[PDB]
Design an enzyme around this catalytic site. Structure first.
Site, mmCIF file in Angstrom:
data_model
loop_
_atom_site.group_PDB
_atom_site.id
_atom_site.type_symbol
_atom_site.label_atom_id
_atom_site.label_comp_id
_atom_site.label_asym_id
_atom_site.label_seq_id
_atom_site.Cartn_x
_atom_site.Cartn_y
_atom_site.Cartn_z
ATOM 1 C CB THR A 262 33.479 -1.909 -8.985
ATOM 2 O OG1 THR A 262 32.926 -2.526 -10.157
ATOM 3 C CG2 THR A 262 34.550 -0.871 -9.385
ATOM 4 C CG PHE A 387 26.245 2.713 -9.956
ATOM 5 C CD1 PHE A 387 27.014 1.635 -10.317
ATOM 6 C CD2 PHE A 387 25.328 2.539 -8.955
ATOM 7 C CE1 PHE A 387 26.871 0.421 -9.688
ATOM 8 C CE2 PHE A 387 25.196 1.330 -8.318
ATOM 9 C CZ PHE A 387 25.950 0.269 -8.700
ATOM 10 C CB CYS A 394 28.172 2.580 -13.651
ATOM 11 S SG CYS A 394 28.606 0.843 -13.840
#
Ligand code: HEM
Ligand code: HEM
Ligand SMILES: O=C(CCCCCn1ccnc1)N[C@@H](Cc1ccccc1)C(=O)O
Ligand SMILES: O=C(CCCCCn1ccnc1)N[C@@H](Cc1ccccc1)C(=O)O
Ligand SMILES: C=Cc1ccccc1
Ligand SMILES: C=Cc1ccccc1
Ligand SMILES: C=Cc1ccccc1
Ligand SMILES: C=Cc1ccccc1
Lengths: 449, 449
Positions: A262, A387, A394
């Site tokens: 990512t 996120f 995240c």
């Protein structure tokens, strides 16, 4: 009230629509046609794809919806186990690991990771200064070398040494091959895939063995500024318990999966948008030149690279590299005052569509304009979710942004860049997104390190 | 490293008598033409430094190194604006509270709800001009102040000042403008020579202001979608607390101060530059006609007035109507690598000089060319600061531009304009700037509403 639904394939319903090598981009085009919500059916599965901020702001209410494991995450669970990414919120190891690992991911903890991130970033810069004239850079390949080594070193003091290799490290050959089999199971129990299944299990062993050995190796007694050290010594304040050895391995595998791809996609998309928007690159290069006044950036200097951050956020707006997450309804509820949902019903948040919400961003949604992010407090709630959401957002967001800002800042300080092929954006899709075949030439500005 | 220039002094009064002039910003700009990008300005009990180059102001805009300071002007406005958003220090708890509560009602998405009330006032101004007799003229800043004052009253707290029904301004604004006048006069007083009349008047002026507002707050508490409603029902997400009734009245006074004057100055300068540059006027009128195809502009049509927006940005470049802001150094730091600053040292940003930086805008800085603003990415960082900087930038920026675009668009659609007196620009200085005595003739195009 009546929910739109794309074209069907008999008993397979909508599933063959995902039998394509760019399924997120296929799903975006379906949302372009059908609007903010559409039902997507498969044998044994029903979900709804959300694309507007108005509906997604409600799906993001943690009192009404919790994180669901999409089919992609359930297949990754076969080797990420009950790590933080692939566990349910009610599972005892989620909250435990969450409480133990949140301090190692704060913006304050990046002061301790910074020196190791600079270690790998210098290797990237030196690689590029050592290219011969008219040699080019394969951008996503080199950003992946950087992100995987960064997490290996910062996470468990391990050197994958990717810049010394052509063929990737054996652990990540199996890991990328496992992730590759997981995506293939999505768009598929026949006997021809039996080979893949036997290969999948051998790949799990390669991953577990390397990781389980590192855990055993370290438990030497040495203490280093890495995630592994916090995981062997940390205790959840809630239950007062440390993570048991199996869960540590799942976390390590998790951080490697969630780490590199990512983040390397973000760096790769950022550099593509810079070379396609020369005015923006000039402004980012001037910032890098005037802020990074030392041969090695410090933590504080990196925090001053504000325009570099804006470039990163706008690259995340157009192509968020972890492009969806899934939710389920905790109880019966109505979505948007028009879509009644039953307890357990599933939602998918299509992040790239959300980020193109014209009612939020105006009409120039496709244009790359970092100036959108000058004042971050101004951006409406839940309009920008690269996120994820809430307590299941995240955990490595600050890590990823600090690495990417540092590395882009150093790239912009040290080289001029040329789009010598006039590269045509071609987005390859795994479970993440990256610009395939993206190449550039770098002309060194000959600034020493 | 570099000795900082300083303009002429007057013994123990230092530079202060330089401000005892009726055009002090224009006097400060000419001092900057003589001395360059930075000069020290001393007063009894005060030391500040006036910055005029993008090269230095781009560092001053670094929020990790400098925060907003209250200039002497703002300290005096604070005597009746209290800790409203404009005259509060960033560390004051009511700044962040009110900031978090009020940002959603000033968003671009919120302008969709103000639009109808903005059109209400714009139609009133249009009808006033179409009801003029032949050879009658328009007093431009006077009518733009009528419009902006009524728009903030209506959109802000559903109060109709009915400025277009009046010759003598509203009683509330009589003290409000007279309080601002006393604040500016305190600046340029070489004092206490029996100024008590001014002091006694200042207190009665404050009492008029609080009483009207405190009654409106009391009236309302015994629902309309306006700023007052959000301020009574809004809770800060952070502390979870709402604004107290005292702070609400400071915000209301602040919006009335900050609303109308700066925005009517902008529309007035915009129309001045348009009638002094007929090709630019024609180009904007042509855009108005093909976009404003309905008798009443919609929110969306205003967003399509792209050239009108550039015209507004170009008037803001030449004559920013809020012409300075103040900053202080959070820690010892070096400005531009040559001017050491101690913690607490003050800076003034002279916005109109900044906007004349030839290294940024080329050599034709004095020419009115809206095409400079076709791409915001082409503009270097912090070169264009009409709305201040960072988290202390103008919260009403989107309100002001939408009002000014709507109103300028309707003006260009409905009338041709004549600079009948060949008006010579004469900039009157309060705490803001306006073109005094600016008059025009408008010939109706006879397009109905
Ligand atoms: C080294 C960098 C990173 C690490 C170590 C990391 C780690 C993680 C972990 C452990 C989770 C699960 C958290 C939980 O449920 O408790 C997570 C979630 C997530 N991450 Fe990251 N991550 C990184 C970079 C990124 C980047 C660059 C992006 C996107 C551009 C991203 C997007 C997401 C999203 C969307 C989720 C939520 C997924 C869902 O709700 O199912 N991550 N990350
Ligand atoms: C109806 C229109 C307007 C409203 C309601 C409004 C309101 C405000 C408020 C509340 C602040 C303080 C924000 C904070 O510190 O949190 C502010 C700051 C500021 N405004 Fe506006 N304003 C308007 C129009 C304008 C216009 C037209 C201009 C200039 C062309 C302008 C220039 C500025 C500047 C330069 C600052 C920063 C002042 C400083 O740093 O000391 N405003 N405005
Ligand atoms: O939409 C997606 C893409 C989400 C991938 C995100 C994985 N990620 C996130 C962060 N790091 C990895 N996945 C669906 C597809 C599907 C729908 C219906 C039926 C079968 C499959 C799913 O898995 O359910
Ligand atoms: O430069 C200025 C002009 C700025 C006025 C801003 C008015 N505005 C801004 C936003 N809404 C109103 N003001 C100085 C003058 C001064 C300098 C040194 C010593 C004494 C006085 C000050 O008062 O700080
Ligand atoms: C008369 C115009 C003028 C110009 C600069 C400063 C003071 C006055
Ligand atoms: C948390 C304190 C703070 C610091 C700067 C701006 C707003 C609030
Ligand atoms: C010019 C300011 C004004 C405002 C209200 C009524 C009359 C005049
Ligand atoms: C086109 C005019 C312009 C405007 C800003 C920067 C450089 C050029």
């Amino acid at each position: 009230k009546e929910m739109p639904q794309p074209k069907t394939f008999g008993e397979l319903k909508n599933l063959p629509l995902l039998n394509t090598d760019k399924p997120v981009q296929a799903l975006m085009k379906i949302a372009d046609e059908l609007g903010e919500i559409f039902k997507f059916e498969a044998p044994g599965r029903v979900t709804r794809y959300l694309s507007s901020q108005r509906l997604i702001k409600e799906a993001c209410d943690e009192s009404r919806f919790d994180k669901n494991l999409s089919q992609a995450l359930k297949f990754v669970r076969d080797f990420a186990g009950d790590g933080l990414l692939t566990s349910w919120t009610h599972e005892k190891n989620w909250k435990k690991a969450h409480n133990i690992l949140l301090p190692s991911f704060s913006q304050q903890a990046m002061k301790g990771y910074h020196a190791m991130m600079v270690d790998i970033a210098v290797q990237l810069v030196q690689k590029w200064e050592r290219l011969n004239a008219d040699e080019h850079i394969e951008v996503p390949e080199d950003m992946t070398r950087l992100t995987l080594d960064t997490i290996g070193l910062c996470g468990f003091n391990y050197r994958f040494n990717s810049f010394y290799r052509d063929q990737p490290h054996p652990f990540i050959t199996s890991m990328v091959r496992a992730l590759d089999e997981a995506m293939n199971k999505l768009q598929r129990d026949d006997p021809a895939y039996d080979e893949n299944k036997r290969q999948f299990q051998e790949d799990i062993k390669v991953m577990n063995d390397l990781v389980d050995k590192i855990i055993a190796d370290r438990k030497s007694g040495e203490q280093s500024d890495d995630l592994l050290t916090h995981m062997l010594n940390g205790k959840d304040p809630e239950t007062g318990e440390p993570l048991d050895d199996e869960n540590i391995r799942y976390q390590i595998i998790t951080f490697l999966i969630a780490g590199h791809e990512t983040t390397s996609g973000l760096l790769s998309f950022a550099l593509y948008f810079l070379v396609k928007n020369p005015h923006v690159l000039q402004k980012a290069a001037e910032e890098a030149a005037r802020v990074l006044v030392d041969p090695v950036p410090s933590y504080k200097q990196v925090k001053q690279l504000k325009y570099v951050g804006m470039v990163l956020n706008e690259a995340l707006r157009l192509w968020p590299t972890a492009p969806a997450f899934s939710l389920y309804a905790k109880e019966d509820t109505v979505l948007g005052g028009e879509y009644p949902l039953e307890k357990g019903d599933e939602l998918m948040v299509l992040i790239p569509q959300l980020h193109r919400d014209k009612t939020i961003w105006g009409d120039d949604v496709e244009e790359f304009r970092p100036e959108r992010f000058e004042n971050p407090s101004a951006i409406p709630q839940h309009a920008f979710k690269p996120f994820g959401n809430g307590q299941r957002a995240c955990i490595g967001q600050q890590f990823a942004l600090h690495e990417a800002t540092l590395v882009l800042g150093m790239m912009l300080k040290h080289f001029d860049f040329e789009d010598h092929t006039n590269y045509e954006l071609d987005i390859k899709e795994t479970l993440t997104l990256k610009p395939e075949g993206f190449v550039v030439k770098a002309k060194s500005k000959k600034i020493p390190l």
